[PDB]
Design a binder for this molecule. Structure first.
Ligand SMILES: COCCCc1cc(Nc2nc(NCc3cc(C)no3)ncc2Br)[nH]n1
Ligand SMILES: COCCCc1cc(Nc2nc(NCc3cc(C)no3)ncc2Br)[nH]n1
Lengths: 272, 278
């Protein structure tokens, strides 16, 4: 990987067919830019490109490659951010993926405090669909949150950061979406992502609310150990609150599965 | 030590002391002729100082001046001569409002929407009365509201001596909660207490009622509380709460003290809302 990467003709795009545009966002040693891809024959497709920052290390490269390779194995679904291609040869790695013009679901919800009760349940349905798909492909997210759900021009929910390779790192605290087993016992399962979906559900029905405002890490632990559970939001049926509460069962085996959650939300949507 | 006050003195032999309530004891007063009335009696503990006596006397004298209202814990008498000071006050059999509401949470009989709005009305009435007598509570919370056998709300601890320049903000209550979470910012940061800061605390109490004894800012320590307040943070609307009653809480938590409603206004609004609530 130091002088050259392996080629995968299934996915390789010519660099002349990609025009890089305005940055969308960055992270530790990776960054995401808006771009235009020609012929993924001669139609331009607005895509998002993920690539390393200039200060990245060999291990950052190896992380980014592993992310791309997981996206290949997992395959396509409408409610996830899909791999569309890659430039791997003769220069920096560009991992080309779908563009979601409306940004993350947290912001999306906050800027519309105008969604109906149906639309809100529909969001929740789409997210669980994406998660039901990923879980069928052995994919555990480990940070399912509204910040990691992107929304498209046409209001499709698309899970992101599912292929990625310090409890005090924030400006909110991710530990506030972690299942107790994952936080306390470092047990990550599909059921631990169910707990996280519980909190996303709550974010959804508070239209982008912040879990546990003002609660620092040590206190959160203390709340968890006491069996504390966030209060029902206003503008939330008692059914939905029991879905959240169900996702928040202490025993993961008694939490519902994403398969079960999709079935319920499909029913609930139709009756909203 | 004590000076005699014939307006209030009950002979010691007329008071039959019973079980501890939590110091405060349950008692029976004979007379107050051949009838016994259940009463609560406040008295000193064994390890009490002269400062503690002084503070108990001040509380009693304050009750004398304030006079009687249905929605406060009313002074009934005192034993001041030839033995321990006993301040005799009304008995509330169903305990504090926090516990009263939590015991009535669904799985004791549930409270209607009207019952909850009626609690709010009665507390506001008591506060309006206290305000009228020039009294500022300084720790209005559901824990300092007591409930009688016939479900009458009575405000307690309204006459208490407190040095505000010696408050421990870190000190938790017995239930595990922090009293700073009921305090107007201007009282908290600037030690300025007014009827207006009491109205702020009433907003928090209204919140406590509609969450059926919920704990404000759960898991938020003192330093983080300050930072939420400085940022103008406000608690979210409880579920099963009208927009109209959440607007009331929000009004009580106005950042500018002059712009909060008075208890006179709160009393009138709540009266109107009680009559229209199912
Ligand atoms: C590897 O795929 C990462 C997501 C690709 C993507 C990004 C967008 N649109 C937007 N992205 C961002 N920030 C980049 C980002 C957010 C997350 C989560 N991950 O990366 N900001 C605004 C927009 Br609009 N579409 N597809
Ligand atoms: C001088 O006013 C003291 C309150 C008089 C009173 C107390 C009760 N009933 C109960 N009291 C307590 N704990 C003592 C207490 C609570 C507060 C507030 N202040 O003192 N526990 C249970 C009951 Br029931 N009735 N009247």
């Amino acid at each position: 990987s130091e002088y050259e990467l392996p080629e995968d003709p299934r996915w390789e795009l010519p660099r002349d067919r990609l025009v890089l545009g305005k940055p969308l966002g960055e992270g530790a040693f990776g960054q995401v830019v808006l771009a235009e891809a020609i012929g993924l024959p001669n139609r331009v497709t607005k895509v998002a490109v993920k690539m390393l920052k200039s200060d990245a290390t060999e291990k950052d490269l190896s992380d980014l490659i592993s992310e791309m390779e997981m996206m290949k194995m997992i395959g396509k679904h409408k409610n996830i951010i899909n791999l569309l291609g890659a430039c791997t040869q003769d220069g920096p790695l560009y991992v080309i993926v779908e563009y979601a013009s409306k940004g993350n679901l947290r912001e999306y919800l906050q800027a519309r405090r105008q969604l109906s009760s149906k639309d809100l349940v529909s969001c929740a349905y789409q997210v669980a669909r994406g998660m039901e798909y990923l879980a069928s492909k052995k994919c555990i997210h480990r940070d399912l949150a509204a910040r990691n759900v992107l929304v498209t021009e046409d209001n499709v929910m698309k899970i992101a950061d599912f292929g990625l390779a310090d409890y005090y790192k924030k400006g909110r605290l991710p530990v506030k979406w972690m299942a107790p087993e994952a936080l306390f016992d470092r047990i990550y399962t599909h059921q631990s992502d169910v707990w996280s979906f519980g909190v996303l559900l709550w974010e959804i029905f508070t239209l982008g609310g912040s879990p546990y405002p003002g609660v620092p890490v040590e206190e959160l632990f203390k709340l968890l150990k006491e069996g504390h559970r966030m209060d029902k939001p206003s503008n939330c049926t008692n059914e939905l609150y029991m879905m959240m509460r169900d996702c928040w069962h202490a025993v993961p085996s008694q939490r519902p599965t994403f398969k079960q959650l999709v079935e319920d939300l499909d029913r609930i949507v139709a009756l909203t």
